[PDB]
Design a protein around this ligand. Structure first.
Ligand SMILES: CCCCCCCC(=O)OC[C@H](COP(=O)(O)O[C@@H]1[C@H](O)[C@H](O)[C@@H](OP(=O)(O)O)[C@H](OP(=O)(O)O)[C@H]1O)OC(=O)CCCCCCC
Ligand SMILES: CCCCCCCC(=O)OC[C@H](COP(=O)(O)O[C@@H]1[C@H](O)[C@H](O)[C@@H](OP(=O)(O)O)[C@H](OP(=O)(O)O)[C@H]1O)OC(=O)CCCCCCC
Ligand SMILES: CCCCCCCCCCCC(=O)OC[C@H](COP(=O)(O)OCC[N+](C)(C)C)OC(=O)CCCCCCCCCCC
Ligand SMILES: CCCCCCCCCCCC(=O)OC[C@H](COP(=O)(O)OCC[N+](C)(C)C)OC(=O)CCCCCCCCCCC
Ligand SMILES: *[C@@H]1O[C@H](CO[C@@H]2O[C@@H](C)[C@@H](O)[C@@H](O)[C@@H]2O)[C@@H](O[C@@H]2O[C@H](CO)[C@@H](O)[C@H](O)[C@H]2NC(C)=O)[C@H](O)[C@H]1NC(C)=O
Ligand SMILES: *[C@@H]1O[C@H](CO)[C@@H](O)[C@H](O)[C@H]1NC(C)=O
Lengths: 517, 517
């Protein structure tokens, strides 16, 4: 699959031939209750980050791109990717690095007196050209170089960032409405509370903890022995929706306490009508775009391409692992082409460019996964789940009355649950846990038995140092260099690590799949 | 040991003979960190209910019996019972039915124009006479008739009462300080808040949930593989103290929110100085005790003896079961005599009559229990744990500055945890769980393989009906007759059940111990 065919666009046609014959099976496998449960869960997990990043992006870019644009982009791109994608299980949405790049580009354009939206259009054109060139030469074959080392480092970092962001949101809620002896009861509540409120912080904390605990308990009940088998599994599949419903109703019955709720724009309207229209003009919105700027937009296009390529391809590698029991097969060349080309086309309309997200995609895959009598029996691989998630995200603007009832604390707890669950499949997390377990309690696995405990611990420590460096770079102002450090981890594995460690130990610890040799 | 020796006071002498030789080993066994952890845990578990019941009794008795009297009685009774008791594991304290009887007798006295404390003293005289007569006749042999049926029904009822009372106290906290849009800050803060306060109800809920969660997680931590062996066991033993410290610190660092704190009397004085003195004269403080009343106190004293004897003997049965691995052993005759005689002594001084609590006794047993790496390897039997707990309870007034820092929410969570852990060892709870499990998942136990599933479920349903009847009796104002209804289960087991169940089914279901049947 990843190997170069040697012919122009060979990988893309190979992926098409490999995946599209199973198109009828993709629709047929969707008709199941687990599919509906995954649809609801991933719909919430994709809608909430869309709104959060839309708000942040509208704040940073002066509403040039806002919540409505991001929601429409997510809906359209998800629909198209599910319909025509080699790996339908991936969920395309905005991520933190993209927001950082967008704000940096906005600041640069402000400094240089250029139109931000037109610069984005030209970056999108350059991205389309670059992705066409890459897919032509089967540049996705380079994904083979990315080892389990980099995959697990990236997944662990993403999960840690997710958990830390959830806790940071909780800290922000507490700081906005601190527990104080005296409050003011004339506080304006529009657009947001203008002062501290009583019971808001503790109520939000209680709601988040309750939803997290309910989701975890239902997850345990899924594989437990209580109740019949089929009914137990059916209830467990709907665990997250049930927890969300329980906590939403609990908050709803509480009427004298204020808690923040999901907010969606009234209608499908451009965020800043004065600043932009629905369709951007590449030549110029109000003034002539510079020739030098349109020619130099290639470099920002290169940075965005690195971001999207790294994220999407690593997500594809994680989801398509042999342990996941994926059998239909994913296409690296088709997925990258679709994602980057759609991002470039959206840039023309002024919508953001989206990339497959690690946590959303992993949660989508695990939600469809069915586990037989601690082993993954099968994964319900189909296109309808992601298609319906994208359709609902697009319809979220119309579903204002239902959405406004859901507190943000419930979703924060759900996101903590998502991070914790996504930490399961990483071997780096398992070795981090083994750091605490005494040696005798270590499991019987190829790397535990064939590696001296101290050497394996040194391996995990080096990975932890890499994670710490990546986190420091992410926090530092030059957060856009994170993809380059992630790439640099590959030379660390291929060159530096062999000097410290013997070949056999590297083979056991950094195995491609969960198998011996 | 239950069989009558044929000589008056033979059982008492046999018990003291059996228990005296280990006395030297009892003090030696106390030297271990587990002992200190159990001391702290049981100290909190005994102190908090003592204050609760003392305050409630003072409210009901117009200060004729308050917190100081209960604290002194509990302290002295614990010291004496630990010094001379056949079962040091039992924890002597005040339980609900004693409170109910005290209030009922107060109402009866007010109806008949009698002094409550003097009637209590005469009842104590009659109770001492009753216990002396019973021990003389070896009446403790009737305890052998108490089978697993009544024992487990009583334990399940007490644990359910613990959980229900904790949740009812939480509901009371939420009712006193409801979540409302607007509060008033002119509310007077002494003696207690005179109106709703912000963040108090939610903060109490959060503290209770946090302490319960930390206690459960530290329980899981002891049996898990994390951290070294000895270190992990040491942490696990101190689990409840550690959770209490964590939540107390969390509350302490929060400054602008009020949570009900532990209230210990400043000095050792009678609750109502004018009403009564330290020593109650039998003929009455204010008026002569009617001769007819001192003669009729035999009936209320008879009821009190029935109740206290039932509670203490059943608790001794629970603690001294063969599965508990109580190697040194204990005697029913001696501990009953000590408990009842000391209750009468307390009645003479005016303090109440204390009986060994079920949940506290079971929790002190479990705290001292040492489990091999799934089973009870042994149980530590020391006279120093109970003695130290009693000494600390007596020292509570002297430790007011630290004890006043402990919120009631932490102790409510600790009591919920205590009930939950008490539910562990009851086979009635196991069969209640089995009701939900499918037949294939049922464990390999004598009453599962030997007994048809539907007959076992019928047995469980009959026990549940008995529990429901006991609960209804406890709620209805006939709660004082609850021990009578509890003892009615013995005729049920010896008469009614054999009609429906073959002998083999009863042998399997109601096995006295975990042995071949
Ligand atoms: C605060 C950290 C905890 C103190 C760390 C201080 C360092 C430290 O205490 O390591 C001891 C242990 C080494 O093994 P060690 O020989 O000491 O003993 C092992 C185990 O700790 C128990 O003693 C026994 O298991 P069990 O339960 O009885 O069946 C068994 O000994 P035995 O049966 O043959 O007699 C052994 O399996 O290593 C760790 O467990 C990692 C702990 C976390 C390392 C640090 C994590 C950052
Ligand atoms: C709301 C209550 C639940 C619905 C009540 C309706 C419950 C009801 O109708 O009986 C079903 C079951 C009888 O077991 P039954 O032989 O029919 O089948 C079991 C189980 O139900 C699944 O069918 C299979 O488990 P899994 O797939 O391998 O995991 C397996 O069957 P199979 O392998 O041979 O195909 C068996 O384990 O009984 C209970 O579990 C008690 C539930 C609690 C009873 C109520 C307790 C008060
Ligand atoms: C088991 C946990 C229960 C306890 C909950 C914490 C209550 C503490 C409140 C202090 C008073 C206050 O309002 O402070 C809130 C404080 C600090 O804000 P500040 O005091 O204004 O200082 C900030 C100064 N600014 C205003 C200039 C920025 O924010 C916090 O990080 C509070 C901790 C919240 C996270 C708790 C997570 C618990 C885990 C849940 C997993 C399901
Ligand atoms: C471990 C979970 C324990 C949950 C225990 C909850 C106790 C409160 C029960 C509600 C009714 C009640 O107690 O009523 C109390 C009040 C009163 O209501 P009011 O109409 O203002 O009455 C006015 C006052 N009175 C009753 C004296 C006339 O209600 C409330 O506003 C409480 C807010 C609801 C909190 C629910 C939190 C649940 C979190 C669960 C996720 C972990
Ligand atoms: C909408 O955007 C304007 C900013 O103008 C747009 O962006 C510029 C970079 C440029 O491309 C213009 O042609 C676009 O129309 C926001 O209004 C600005 O407010 C700032 C201060 O916050 C002020 O310095 C600017 O002069 C304002 N610009 C204009 C054109 O009035 C406006 O707040 C945004 N929001 C909405 C709801 O319209
Ligand atoms: C004490 O008892 C007397 C007499 O019954 C009663 O009036 C008074 O309220 C009680 N309380 C105190 C604090 O003395």
């Amino acid at each position: 699959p990843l190997q170069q065919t040697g012919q122009l666009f060979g990988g893309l046609v190979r992926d098409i031939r490999r995946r599209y014959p199973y198109y009828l099976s993709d629709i047929t496998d969707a008709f199941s209750p687990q599919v509906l449960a995954a649809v609801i869960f991933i719909y919430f997990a994709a809608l909430s980050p869309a709104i959060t990043f839309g708000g942040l992006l509208g704040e940073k870019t002066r509403n040039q791109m806002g919540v409505s644009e991001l929601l429409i982009s997510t809906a359209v791109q998800g629909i198209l990717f599910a319909l025509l994608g080699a790996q339908p299980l991936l969920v395309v949405g905005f991520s933190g690095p993209l927001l950082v790049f967008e704000e940096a580009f906005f600041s640069f354009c402000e400094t240089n007196g250029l139109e931000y939206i037109v610069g984005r259009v030209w970056i999108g054109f350059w991205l389309i050209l670059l992705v066409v060139l890459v897919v032509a030469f089967e540049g996705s074959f380079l994904v083979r170089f990315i080892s389990r080392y980099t995959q697990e480092i990236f997944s662990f970092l993403i999960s840690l960032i997710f958990i830390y962001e959830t806790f940071s949101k909780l800290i922000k809620i507490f700081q906005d409405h601190p527990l104080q002896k005296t409050y003011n009861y004339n506080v304006l509540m529009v657009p947001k509370p203008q002062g501290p409120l009583p019971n808001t912080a503790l109520l939000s904390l209680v709601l988040m903890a309750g939803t997290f605990f309910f989701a975890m308990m239902l997850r345990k009940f899924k594989n437990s022995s209580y109740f019949p088998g089929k009914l137990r599994r059916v209830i467990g599949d709907f665990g997250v929706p049930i927890s969300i419903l329980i906590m939403v109703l609990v908050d709803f019955f509480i009427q004298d306490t204020y808690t923040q709720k999901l907010s969606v724009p009234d209608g499908f309207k451009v965020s800043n009508s004065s600043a932009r229209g629905w369709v951007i003009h590449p030549l110029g919105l109000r003034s002539e775009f510079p020739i030098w700027m349109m020619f130099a937009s290639a470099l920002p296009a290169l940075l965005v391409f690195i971001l999207i390529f790294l994220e999407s391809q690593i997500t594809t590698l994680i989801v398509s692992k042999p342990e996941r029991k994926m059998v239909k097969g994913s296409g690296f060349h088709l997925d990258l082409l679709l994602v980057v080309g759609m991002g470039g086309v959206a840039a023309l309309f002024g919508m953001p460019w989206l990339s497959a997200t690690t946590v959303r995609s992993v949660t989508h895959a695990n939600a469809l996964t069915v586990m037989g009598k601690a082993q993954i029996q099968e994964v319900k691989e189909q296109r309808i789940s992601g298609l319906l998630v994208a359709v609902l995200v697009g319809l979220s603007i119309l579903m204002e009355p239902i959405l406004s009832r859901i507190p943000l604390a419930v979703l924060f707890g759900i996101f903590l649950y998502m991070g914790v669950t996504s930490l399961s499949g990483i071997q780096l997390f398992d070795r981090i846990l083994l750091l605490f377990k005494p040696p005798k309690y270590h499991p019987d696995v190829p790397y535990v038995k064939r590696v001296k405990t101290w050497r394996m611990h040194l391996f995990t420590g080096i990975q932890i140092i890499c994670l710490a460096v990546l986190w420091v770079v992410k926090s530092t102002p030059a957060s856009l260099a994170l993809p380059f450090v992630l790439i640099l981890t590959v030379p660390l594995r291929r060159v530096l690590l062999p000097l410290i460690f013997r070949n056999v130990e590297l083979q056991c610890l950094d195995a491609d799949d969960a198998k011996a040799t």
